[PDB]
């Protein structure tokens, strides 16, 4: 069997990207994480403190605690047929804000304002998303130009 070491098989997942080694950019320390917001966990090998375990790399959870340098996260982990909400402490360098939540919060805003505009204008507007409908009927003009006739090419044995 193989070892139970904590960083076994993290040769590439905790390595820095090509020509992106060196000093950690300072805006990562300036990002502000409040209680209740959703963060992506991505371990950085430049900082060895507060490092998430490899099973949480690529996982997304929400902040439940804020400390001086770290953040507590409630992250779902699948364990042999059951999913449990783990609580892990990760330093700030290994997390970033999740853009999926930001997109949804924007859509709530444009929905509420479109309701207010619709009520004030006495109209009805579509607010639910819809899957890509079947393409509508349309005309295609030839512009007096015949379609080009394609034909399979003969076989040639190259080098």
């Amino acid at each position: 069997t193989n070892t139970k070491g904590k960083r076994r098989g993290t040769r590439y997942m905790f390595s820095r990207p090509f020509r992106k080694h060196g000093v950690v950019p300072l805006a990562t320390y300036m990002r502000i994480y409040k209680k209740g917001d959703i963060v992506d966990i991505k371990g950085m090998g430049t900082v060895q403190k507060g490092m998430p375990h490899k099973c949480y790399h690529g996982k997304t959870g929400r902040v439940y605690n804020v400390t001086q340098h770290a953040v507590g996260i409630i992250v779902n982990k699948q364990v042999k047929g059951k999913i449990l909400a783990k609580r892990i402490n990760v330093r700030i360098e290994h997390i970033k804000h999740s853009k999926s939540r930001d997109s949804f919060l924007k859509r709530v805003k444009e929905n509420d304002q479109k309701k207010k505009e619709a009520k004030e204008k006495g109209t009805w507007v579509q607010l639910k998303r819809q899957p890509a409908p079947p393409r509508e009927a349309h005309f295609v003009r030839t512009n007096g130009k015949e379609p080009e006739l394609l034909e399979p090419i003969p076989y040639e044995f190259m080098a």
Binding site: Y64, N65, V66, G72, Q78, I83
Partner: peptide, 17 residues
């Protein structure tokens, strides 16, 4: 089934500062 954990409106304050 792989049941997701139950969600409550109020959660535990266990572990916060």
């Amino acid at each position: 089934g792989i049941k997701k954990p139950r969600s409550q409106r109020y959660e535990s304050l266990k572990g916060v500062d």
